[PDB]
Structure formats: structure tokens, C-alpha cells
């Protein structure tokens, strides 16, 4: 439930400590945790909102010039002087102009020309700093079992750096503990929150401090004092005797195309919600019980309400209806071939499925992990057991290949933290994580200023180079290539 | 540009493709993609369904080019002569015909 | 401005062509509208600035 049709869900089957399992939660997908004697729990990261951000360095992307004025002096006089030069609201430019004997000033040198124009902004795109505080993640939990196809079965957990660990109380199943690392989630304190006009982005610090436009730091109020005062004003020169001042228009689509690779975000009220990120929680499943065990089996007839649908990952979802009234009772369900000898084949990724209500007709939804062959879903005890025919396509080799592909993509997206997905914890895992940290730091220092054009080019170049360099560096260049080009074709 | 009333149309994994009636209108921008669907969402099957979104397009600012043939170009040549003119009549443009 | 041909034809912006009669008809239209696909579930449309 909440994970079935997600198409980017991952199974964290396994718990070698009888306890906590590490799990990295992402905005895209969700995680189903299935332990030995514990109910399957579906966990998903839903929203991360940022609130009361401080304001830093608003930029001006649409300027406007108010009133121009100018001054000239004949060729051997001081310099052109405008009283508006000492005013810090005016852009002033000084140049040389042809003068003499026609302009009423008798000498034929070059004269000085000063033009000043008042500067007035508009729009003022603003960036804001995201501190580790004032940041909050929301995690939704659901529990497999008695739930109908459509609460005590679902929970919501708020995690902020002020309260990194929490417990979700699932009535009857106990409570699931989450000990989480909010501060090291997406490496904020390098990211600013940028708004232009009712559109908001997550943007890098360096990109925001390297953008050429009039700017002023701090919160705005009244008429600000704009800095640089150019890159929006152009002093063009006429036929060697005039100066004209123009402004460049609105600079907004230029910024929109400059912001390629920055994350969108949507703000409601003061709080702005991001739609992409990641977090890392450790799941203490030592107070998780099974609500169902110690229930007698149901002895009645079941019906198939809709069908046994197939999810994208191969698991079957079955929705059953119960006709008897035995109260809370176990659902006898299995995956079998050879109806003569009902030998359980496959795995049931559901609880010791139970019907909760005690009425005439109740409903149930359970999901199963069938074997790759043809099989039958067998529900019921004897002489009333409904069965459904079900066929699964893949093979174990294809499944292992797809698992390696998913792991590779997770690594490309999540750097070293990728090693914390099934992080139950040994010495091979920690060694792999350490050497991955080292190689990732080196790779981010050397490469990592490139964006799928630069990377594809330099990858093909290192490919050829390592192919023909004829030394022991062949392997080095081929591995650097493979890293780069896989990082690319992951997409 | 300026955008306007968006709309969308979605279909179950095993159906055709989504179609809005506003795709037969040359004033709307429409995009078709694949969306996770199934059972919970309300359609019973679990593949990728098809989603179409359309939005009305309007232009609030425009920009125009114009062709220049090498005829109907007029040049204005100004001519002056030395001799009797005094310094004042260097940058004076007046009834030069007289 | 005075502009060269082949700079005014290789421009990626929605273009009418010549005769403006009534409700204009912009030929391109995919150079100013961005369809961002949210997370699995939806689609959103924005315009560039």
C-alpha cells in the first residue's frame, strides 16, 4: 500500500541485526521493508518544506533609466562636470568628442563629454539562504495486511534537525522507530532559494554569486542602492559628437536559460516545498509486532473482486472478498503449481494476511511475489479454494541484471550514500563506502564541472586515449571514461 | 509569451492514448507523456498510462523583421564650398537652397 | 536594428509569417513553453521569461 503502483519502489528484504536497517529515502520512489517476523512496511518521503529563509543579495533583471543629461567642454578646458556625478543613483559615462570652431569653442582638440542617467530597477530577483534549521521532511508510512484496495494502518512522521529521530505508532503493530540524518540530506548551505516572479528554484551558491547584474545584499526596503550599475546600461556613441544611453531589456529569459540544471520548487505562504531531494533514516523495527498471529484460519469461501493485477516489478496484487463471518481470522493464501501436491512456491510479500472485520462480506488486498514460471494463486482451505492462473515473464538472470542496473543508477544519483541502502553493516560495506568516498572526492575535484556534452566528449576522448596509449594507464583512462559515460547515459 | 487555462486527459495502462478536444485547436500547446497508474489511482492495471496536457498560448510582446530591397534607398549628400563663408556657417543647416 | 538574413531566420522563437490578419497563428510554440513532468503522477506547464 502506497508503494504498489509507484514503479520506482525498491525492496529492502533482509535484516541481519534482528533490528534496525538503514534505508535512503528519495522523493522519486518508496521503500518496502520486509523482515523475518515483522509486517511489511511501506515508507516514502513526501515533502520537504523550507521556512523563514534569510534574504541575501537581490539582483535586478529589469532596469529603467529616468532622465539623461550631459556636458561638454572645449578641448583645452578641465573635464566635463555634472553635479549628478556624486549621486550614487546615476550611471555616468565619460568619453571624448570632436569639438572646435563649429561648436562655438575655438580649438580643434578632443573635448570631454559626460552623460549621467538615473537608475531605477524592477523585478529584483532575490536569493535566500537555507540554514540547517527551519528545514523539515515529512515521511508517510503504511503497513501491509488488512488494508482494503482503497487510521492505525498509516502514519505521518515529521523530521527536523531539531528532532532527527521519531517513532511512528501503528496501533496493534507496535511502533516503528526512525533515527534519521536530516542535516546531511542534500548538502544545503551550498544551495540558495531563488525567486524571480512567483517562480522559485534551488540554485547553487557559486552560480548565484557569479551572475553579472546589478545587485544589493541584504533585505530590501524603500529605494535600494544598486551596485555595479551596469550590464543593464549601455552608453553608445553617436557620430563622434553625442552619447546615447539605453537599457538592456528585462534579462529574464536569459536567466531562465542560465538556470539549466537547477531544481524547481513551489512556495505556498512563507514556506517553500521542494519536489526533489533525499534523506537517510535507520529503521528500528524492534517494537514491530504482527497483529494477525494467534488467529484461527478462516473457513469460508473467498471470491476475486477484481483480478490479480501485476505490478511493474512482477508482484501480483490480489483483492479478495470473504463471505463467512468468523471474525478476525488468517487468510490461507499461497502460490502453487501441481494442484495435486500443493507445495508452496514463490514468496508472499504480505503479512500472514488477515481479515479484520466480522461481517457478511469483507474485503482484503494482499500482494505476492510469484515464481517465474506459470503458477496458480490458491486461496482457501479445501473444496472451496478459489484459484487464479498467473504467468510471470522474466528469468532470474534478467532479474539480477535489472538489479545491477538499478544499483548502478542509485550510485550515480547518490554518490557514497548509495552504500547505505542495505547498510545492515559489516566490514566489506564500510570498506566499499570508504574507497567510494575517496574516489568520489577525487572525481568531483577533477571532473564535475561538466554537463553531458563536456562529459561525453571527454569520455570518448579518454576512451580512445586509453585504447591506444600502450601502458599501465590504459586501465586508468578506461575506468575514468566508464565512470564519466555511465554518469551520462544514466540520464 | 503568456499561458492560460491548462487541461489534461489521462488513460489506463492498456487503452489508447489520451486525447483532449483542445488538441484540434491551433492555439494550444499540448504535450503527451507517460504517468504511473493503477488500482489506487482508480484504473485497474499497473503499467504506465498516458497523459496529455494542453495550455492556451498568447503573445503579449512581438518582434518584427522587414525586407529591404536595394532600390528605394535614398542617400542625402551635403555639399559646401570654401571661399566666402565665415566660421559661423560650419554647422548651420538652414535654407541652403538660397 | 539592421540585421543580417540567416541571423533572423535561425532564431528559436515562435514565429508568425508575414500577413497578420486576425487571431495570430504562432508556428513554433515549443521554444517558450516548458512541460515539466513532476514525480510520476503529473505534468505542469510554464513559460520562459
Amino acid at each position: 500500500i502506497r508503494c504498489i503502483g509507484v514503479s520506482n519502489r525498491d525492496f529492502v528484504e533482509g535484516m541481519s541485526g534482528g533490528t534496525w536497517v538503514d534505508v535512503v529515502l528519495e522523493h522519486g520512489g518508496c521503500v518496502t521493508v520486509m523482515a523475518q517476523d515483522k509486517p511489511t512496511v511501506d515508507i516514502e518521503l513526501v515533502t520537504t518544506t523550507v521556512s523563514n529563509m534569510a534574504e541575501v543579495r537581490s539582483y535586478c533583471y529589469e532596469a529603467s533609466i529616468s532622465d539623461m543629461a550631459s556636458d561638454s567642454r572645449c578641448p583645452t578646458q578641465g573635464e566635463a562636470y555634472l553635479d549628478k556625478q556624486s549621486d550614487t543613483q546615476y550611471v555616468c559615462k565619460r568619453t571624448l568628442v570632436d569639438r572646435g570652431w563649429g561648436n562655438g569653442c575655438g580649438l580643434f582638440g578632443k573635448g570631454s563629454l559626460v552623460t549621467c542617467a538615473k537608475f531605477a530597477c524592477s523585478k529584483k530577483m532575490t536569493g535566500k539562504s537555507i540554514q540547517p534549521e527551519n528545514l523539515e521532511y515529512r515521511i508517510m508510512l503504511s503497513v501491509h495486511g488488512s488494508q482494503h484496495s482503497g487510521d492505525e494502518n498509516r502514519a505521518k512522521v515529521e523530521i527536523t534537525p531539531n528532532s532527527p529521530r521519531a517513532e511512528a505508532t501503528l496501533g496493534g503493530f507496535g511502533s516503528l522507530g526512525l533515527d534519521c540524518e536530516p542535516r546531511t540530506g542534500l548538502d544545503f548551505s551550498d544551495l540558495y532559494y531563488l525567486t524571480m516572479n512567483n517562480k522559485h528554484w534551488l540554485v547553487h551558491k557559486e552560480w548565484f554569486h557569479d551572475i553579472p547584474l546589478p545587485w544589493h545584499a541584504g533585505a530590501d526596503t524603500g529605494t535600494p542602492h544598486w551596485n555595479n550599475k551596469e550590464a543593464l546600461v549601455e552608453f553608445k556613441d553617436a557620430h563622434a559628437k553625442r552619447q546615447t544611453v539605453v537599457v538592456l531589456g528585462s534579462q529574464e529569459g536569459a536567466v531562465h536559460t542560465a538556470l539549466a540544471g537547477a531544481l524547481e520548487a513551489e512556495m505556498d505562504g512563507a514556506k517553500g516545498r521542494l519536489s526533489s531531494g533525499h534523506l537517510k533514516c535507520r529503521l528500528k523495527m524492534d517494537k514491530l509486532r504482527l497483529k494477525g498471529v494467534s488467529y484461527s484460519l478462516c473457513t469460508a469461501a473467498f471470491t476475486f473482486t477484481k483480478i490479480p493485477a501485476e505490478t511493474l516489478h512482477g508482484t501480483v496484487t490480489v483483492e479478495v472478498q470473504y463471505a463467512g463471518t468468523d471474525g478476525p481470522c488468517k487468510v490461507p493464501a499461497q502460490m502453487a503449481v501441481d494442484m495435486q501436491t500443493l507445495t508452496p512456491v514463490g514468496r508472499l510479500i504480505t503479512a500472514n494476511p488477515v481479515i479484520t472485520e466480522s461481517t457478511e462480506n469483507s474485503k482484503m488486498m494482499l500482494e505476492l511475489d510469484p515464481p517465474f514460471g506459470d503458477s496458480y494463486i490458491v486461496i482457501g482451505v479445501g473444496e472451496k479454494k478459489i484459484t487464479h492462473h498467473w504467468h510471470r515473464s522474466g528469468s532470474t538472470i534478467g532479474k539480477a541484471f535489472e538489479a545491477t542496473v538499478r544499483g548502478a543508477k542509485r550510485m550515480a544519483v547518490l554518490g557514497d550514500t548509495a552504500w547505505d541502502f542495505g547498510s545492515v553493516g559489516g566490514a566489506l560495506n564500510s570498506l566499499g563506502k570508504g574507497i567510494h568516498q575517496i574516489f568520489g572526492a577525487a572525481f568531483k575535484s577533477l571532473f564535475g564541472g561538466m554537463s553531458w556534452f563536456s562529459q561525453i566528449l571527454i569520455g570518448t576522448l579518454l576512451m580512445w586515449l586509453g585504447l591506444n596509449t600502450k601502458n599501465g594507464s590504459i586501465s586508468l583512462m578506461c575506468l575514468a571514461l566508464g565512470g564519466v559515460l555511465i554518469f551520462l547515459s544514466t540520464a | 509569451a503568456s499561458i492560460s487555462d491548462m487541461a489534461s486527459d489521462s488513460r489506463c495502462p492498456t487503452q489508447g492514448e489520451a486525447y483532449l478536444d483542445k488538441q484540434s485547436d491551433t492555439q494550444y500547446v499540448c504535450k503527451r507523456t507517460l504517468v504511473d497508474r493503477g488500482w489506487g489511482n482508480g484504473c485497474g492495471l499497473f503499467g504506465k498510462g498516458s497523459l496529455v496536457t494542453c495550455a492556451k498560448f498568447a503573445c503579449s510582446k512581438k518582434m518584427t523583421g522587414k525586407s529591404i530591397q536595394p532600390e528605394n534607398l535614398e542617400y542625402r549628400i551635403m555639399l559646401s564650398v570654401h571661399g566666402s563663408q565665415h566660421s559661423g556657417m560650419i554647422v548651420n543647416d538652414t535654407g541652403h537652397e538660397t | 536594428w539592421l540585421v543580417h538574413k540567416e541571423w533572423f531566420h535561425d532564431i528559436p522563437l515562435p514565429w508568425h509569417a508575414g500577413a497578420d490578419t486576425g487571431t495570430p497563428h504562432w508556428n513554433n510554440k515549443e521554444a517558450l513553453v516548458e512541460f515539466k513532468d513532476a514525480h510520476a503522477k503529473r505534468q505542469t506547464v510554464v513559460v520562459l521569461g
Epitope: 513526501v46 515533502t47 508517510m140 484496495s149 482503497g150 505556498d268 516545498r273 473482486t305 477484481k306 472478498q321 | 487541461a7 489534461s8 486527459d9 489521462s10 488513460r11 489506463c12 487503452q15 489520451a18 483532449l20 488500482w39 489506487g40 489511482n41 482508480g42 484504473c43 485497474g44 | 513532476a38 514525480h39 503522477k41 503529473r42
Partner: antibody, heavy 127, light 108 residues
């Protein structure tokens, strides 16, 4: 428990505009979307539109696209529907119904049980 | 928008069926089919959602079925307190709601 209560009945001459509220109680108002359904006397029900009380997005039917405006007041837990340019056909009963909004805060897909709770109704008489 | 029979009558103690025919965009493609019961004076009450599924405090006599473009509500064991208006509703593919014409059930 869940209780949606609308304003009392109202009589308006044609050409005027009606504004009917729907106060919600017994649940978190910010996490639900309110639909407005009109029922003519002894006729079918007519869906007019909905408003997501969380962020404020709205969607109206094609039949009322340019005649109805739905707004909300979270602090007061109210949803208002205003219909302008009344006609004799608009003499009908107006109901408000809740529907759960997705956990991401968006209302793209409705939940299977859309109109689990309704309002008692409000008769608008166009004379 | 949804084709529903004008009226349906049945003697107390027998089953009866009310059909609801739609198109391939509202009832044909989606399990978004709901049945509402409305006694005169009161507001409609959700009797069935998700086609077959029904809420908690609803008698198990009401059943739902769907074939192609036609949904169907079945009332087995017609009781006294069943004379009301029954409306089928569906969430279309374009994101709008459509209701049925209406059926007045008479228990006689």
C-alpha cells in the same frame, strides 16, 4: 464528526449573483478539496467544480467555466461559491462535498470514495 | 451524461438491478464508479465506491458490478427503507465528474 453546514436558503432576482458558504467541522480543513454540486428540482445532479483548500487551485466545469468563482477561508474553515448572472434555470439546490487531497498536497487524482460526506443543501430561488 | 433507467419497482423480498451506461472515458475505462442513495429531504449518501466496494456502515445487500461501459447496482433482499433516488457518478478521463439521470426505486 465530519459536518458540512451551508448557509440558509436564498431568493434572488435574475441578473443578480448568489454567494453560498460551506463551513466544515470535524476534520483538518486544509487537507481536503471541496466540490460543489447543483441539483435541479427532480432532476439529475450537476457537478460544478472543486477547490483545493490546501494551496487554492480550482477547477470548474465547462458549463460554468465563466460564471462561477470558488474561494476558501482556511482560518474560518469555509468554502464560498459565487455564481453571477443568474438565470431561471439556476433555481436549484446547492450541495458541498469533501474529498481527500493527495499526501503531496496536490489534487490530480481523486480518491476512490469522492463524495463520502455532503452538505445539507441550500435552495437558491431565481424569480 | 450517464444513461440510467427512469424508475424501477420490486416487491419486498426479491433482488433488483439498476444499470448505468457510460462511455469509454468515464465508466468504460476507470473503476471510478460510485452509487449514491438519496431519500427525499436528505442529502445523498455514498452507498458504493470503487465499483464493488462499499463503505463501512452499509448493509451487505448492495453489490456492484461492471461490464464494458455499463455499471450495475444490485439490491438483494429488498427491504422497506429502500425507496429513494439512486444516482451513479463517474470521474471522467479529463478530470471532471458526471452523474446519472436518476432512478426512483419503489418497494411497493
Amino acid at each position: 464528526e465530519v459536518q458540512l453546514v451551508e448557509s440558509g436558503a436564498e431568493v434572488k432576482k435574475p441578473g443578480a449573483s448568489v454567494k453560498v458558504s460551506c463551513k466544515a467541522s470535524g476534520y483538518t480543513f486544509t487537507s481536503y478539496a471541496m466540490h460543489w454540486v447543483r441539483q435541479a428540482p427532480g432532476q439529475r445532479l450537476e457537478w460544478m467544480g472543486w477547490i483545493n483548500a490546501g494551496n487554492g487551485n480550482t477547477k470548474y466545469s465547462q458549463k460554468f467555466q465563466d460564471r462561477v468563482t470558488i474561494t476558501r477561508d482556511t482560518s474560518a474553515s469555509t468554502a464560498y461559491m459565487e455564481l453571477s448572472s443568474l438565470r431561471s434555470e439556476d433555481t436549484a439546490i446547492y450541495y458541498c462535498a469533501r474529498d481527500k487531497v493527495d499526501d503531496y498536497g496536490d489534487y490530480w487524482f481523486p480518491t476512490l470514495w469522492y463524495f463520502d460526506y455532503w452538505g445539507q443543501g441550500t435552495l437558491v430561488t431565481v424569480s | 451524461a450517464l444513461t440510467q433507467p427512469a424508475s424501477v419497482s420490486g416487491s419486498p423480498g426479491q433482488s433488483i438491478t439498476i444499470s448505468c451506461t457510460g462511455t469509454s472515458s468515464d465508466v468504460g475505462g476507470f473503476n471510478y464508479v460510485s452509487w449514491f442513495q438519496q431519500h427525499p429531504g436528505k442529502a445523498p449518501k455514498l452507498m458504493l465506491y470503487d465499483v464493488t466496494s462499499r463503505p463501512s456502515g452499509v448493509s451487505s445487500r448492495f453489490s456492484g458490478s461492471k461490464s464494458g461501459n455499463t455499471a450495475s447496482l444490485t439490491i438483494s433482499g429488498l427491504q422497506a427503507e429502500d425507496e429513494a433516488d439512486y444516482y451513479c457518478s463517474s470521474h471522467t478521463s479529463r478530470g471532471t465528474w458526471v452523474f446519472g439521470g436518476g432512478t426512483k426505486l419503489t418497494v411497493l
